[PDB]
Amino acid sequence: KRFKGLEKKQDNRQEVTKRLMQIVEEMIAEANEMWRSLHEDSQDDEDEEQPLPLIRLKVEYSSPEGTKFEVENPQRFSNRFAGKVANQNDVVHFYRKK
Amino acid sequence: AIEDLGRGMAAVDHAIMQYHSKMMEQINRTIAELWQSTYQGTDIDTIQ
């Protein structure tokens, strides 16, 4: 719903990245909060440093018909979050239903 | 006779060209199926 398929009738490469940023970024929002909820006690007496959470997003780019969603390089997409995710090698895996 | 053999060139060359293209379809018919069945990581759709 969030996309409403604004890519289906138009070019996609430029804004597709823009689309996932809001999705990947908010995942990290709850990634730290749940860590924070469990680390509220002890007032971070030990291990005060905040570890980089792990994020994995499973996207299927199946196109209904006459549509070509643009898919970015996995590695290049992943490393864009260097310093926010531990698994910089891969943060999203793109697959098409067979 | 020279004309006949000169177009014999074309016949054999055309014949040989017919065998090369079709095999790429056959072999490629077989290769795509095994790779799709065997690979499970899914980061590569198929190879030709």
Query: How does DSSP assign A32-69, residue by residue?
Result: HHHHHHHTTGGGG-SS-S-PPPP--EEEE---SSS---
Contact A57, A23 (CB under 8 A): yes
Cα–Cα distance for residue pair A15/A70, rounded to 1 Å:
10
Question: What are the beta bridge partners of residue B13?
Answer: none
Cα–Cα distance for residue pair A22/A38, rounded to 1 Å:
25
A85 secondary structure, DSSP code: B
Contact residues for B42 (Cβ-Cβ < 8 A; gap 6+): A93, A95
Cα–Cα distance for residue pair A80/A77, rounded to 1 Å:
6
Contact A35, A50 (CB under 8 A): yes
Rg (CA), chain A: 17
Cα–Cα distance for residue pair A50/A44, rounded to 1 Å:
10
Rg (CA), chain B: 19
Contact A80, A18 (CB under 8 A): no
Cβ separation of B42 and A74 shorter than 8 Å? no
CA distances to A18, A37, A44, A74, A91 from A81, rounded to whole Å, are 14, 24, 25, 12, 9
Cα–Cα distance for residue pair B36/A96, rounded to 1 Å:
12
Name the minimum distance, in Å, from the CA of A93 to any CA of chain B: 7
Cβ separation of A74 and B43 shorter than 8 Å? yes
Tokens standing for residue B17: 């060209």
Question: What are the beta bridge partners of residue A93?
Answer: A58
Name the minimum distance, in Å, from the CA of A81 to any CA of chain B: 20
Which CATH number applies to A1-95? Answer: 3.30.110.110
CA distances to A71, A93, B25, B26 from B35, rounded to whole Å, are 22, 19, 16, 15
- Is the CB of B42 inside 8 Å of chain A's CB atoms? yes
Resolution of the solved structure (Å): 4.0
User: Is the dihedral angle over the CA atoms A52, A73, A97, B22 positive or is it negative?
Assistant: negative
- Method of determination is cryo-EM
How many residue contacts between A and B have a Cβ separation below 8 Å?
6
